[PDB]
Amino acid sequence: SFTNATFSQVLDDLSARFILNLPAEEQSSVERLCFQIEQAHWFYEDFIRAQNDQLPSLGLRVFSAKLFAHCPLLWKWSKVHEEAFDDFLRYKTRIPVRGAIMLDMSMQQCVLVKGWKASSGWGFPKGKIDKDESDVDCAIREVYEETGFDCSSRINPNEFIDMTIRGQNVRLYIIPGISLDTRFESRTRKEISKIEWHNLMDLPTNKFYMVIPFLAPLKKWIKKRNIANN
Amino acid sequence: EDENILRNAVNLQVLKFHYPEIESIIDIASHVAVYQFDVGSQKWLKTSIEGTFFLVKDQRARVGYVILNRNSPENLYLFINHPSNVHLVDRYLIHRTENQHVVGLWMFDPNDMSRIFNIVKESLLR
């Protein structure tokens, strides 16, 4: 674990784990180094800071500048290409999003939301975190605003799929046993036009582009739960 | 000796924070993906471990390797107890541990695979 590491040891670890040992072609690409920096920042924020809250919360760009200093081969070169790094990483981070994967009792159906447009895809009910609320309270609020359902008495803070795609972190709480006859309605959302159950085995493994990344971990989770229930 | 100091720079301190028993890094391969052979099911499974591969020796000169996982803090540190249990099959390094517990390693660069195979055999040479 990282509980006893100094901040410098953390950056040393992230440098070795993401950028120091890369093949030459990847290591000389601003773009490819940035994809490594984005994953290192995710690892730092979602794994390392969890084990040591004394470590500072860092913005993607501040993080990148600090990391470069721990990759001997790259600090000076990163300074020469500073504008390119500033440019690539600008606007890459997004406000964390939380919501839920609501399943019925049998765990065969899930609630998905969609807009009115033909081009609009289905997604799980979710939204941006506010400055005050916990990750769990954000999911409860978002699910309520988009589906009219209050999941507060059912949400389990330890059962979720937390997915990061580039700079967008999406944490969805897994909530089974939601009654199929629940009356869903969009309370204050103009962008939510349909709230419907979907049979999980009908979903592709495209109108389901946003949903597809969650399907493998969700199916593994359900499989584990079905085995544990039996 | 210069190339050995170069590969140990930073990396050794990193590995020793997690595994202080590691004495030195022998070789490195970038982007190694780990697979596991499910005996009884007779199928390979791609694990979630992918990262830098470090061939290492411990403070007792025993040879092993660490894969410093990009996907989670859970790394993989195994020993290579008998050189004959490591086989280069097609594009992969196959590592057998006595009780039919088999892992497969895919190294991004094909030249690392054949160099690491040799270095495993010679690091274990008595």
Partner: peptide, 25 residues
């Protein structure tokens, strides 16, 4: 679970490409 999805330079093959370890005996 805590998962990451992003573009990679490396493309590791699917598990089906690996050979059956016939040295098992």
């Amino acid at each position: 679970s805590i998962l990451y999805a992003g573009p990679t330079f490396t493309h590791s093959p699917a598990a089906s490409n690996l050979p059956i370890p016939t040295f098992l005996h």
